[PDB]
Amino acid sequence: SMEASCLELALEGERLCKSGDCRAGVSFFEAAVQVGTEDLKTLSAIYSQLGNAYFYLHDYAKALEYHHHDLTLARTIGDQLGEAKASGNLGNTLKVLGNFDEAIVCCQRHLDISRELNDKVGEARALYNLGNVYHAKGKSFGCPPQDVGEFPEEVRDALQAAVDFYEENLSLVTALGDRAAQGRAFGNLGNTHYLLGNFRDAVIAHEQRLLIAKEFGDKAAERRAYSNLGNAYIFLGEFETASEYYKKTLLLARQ
């Protein structure tokens, strides 16, 4: 039937994206769309795959559109988890585009549904996703030195809010034992502090990020941590310190 062949093409697409070549994976997903199916669970899944595929490819407009169809459809068939997820992805995409307000609503939904269903895994991710949004939002005021000295309570509020999500996230992910996740949260938590002017707090966060990076054998994350650490010391005045972390950074990407 047309079901079977649509099922095949998607399955392929998954292994293709799973194995690095998402460009071709997209094509197989689109193809499976072109074939189509009376099973909307499956279709829903496929649009999602496309949404992310295209997200990774930096074509955010198309990701938005594919997740919006996913979201709609999950609502259509009463798939709460599916709606939680599609929300998340749409939210993140909206963040990337700079439509923070609607992004917040979308990520907020993801959270609420994940709480309802008592999905702690999903709950924590949404907490991280929200973190990034409020971060991005507060970050996108004017430019990122004169900032830390003077800026509006409604921007503070936006950043402090991220901090609160990150911390909550962290807490959650300590329970689930997810080192990777602590990795991500720590980094962004630190930059958020950096902007807020909490530089000693910044360091702590990135030291944890670095440690976790080293533990995973992750050079890019090592690459960053040193970088972000350089910046904070600079703001405390420790230039000889900064000088070295910066050296390590340049020294790293070499290796």
């Binding site: 099973d39 939680a84 993140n92 990337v96 999903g122 996703n129 990795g183 950096y194 960053r224 972000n228």
Partner: peptide, 18 residues
């Protein structure tokens, strides 16, 4: 200026049927 961590996207599979 600052270096940030990647996003997480939740992910659905066809294999969820199985």
């Amino acid at each position: 200026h600052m270096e940030m961590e990647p996003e997480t996207m939740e992910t659905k599979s066809v294999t969820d049927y199985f």
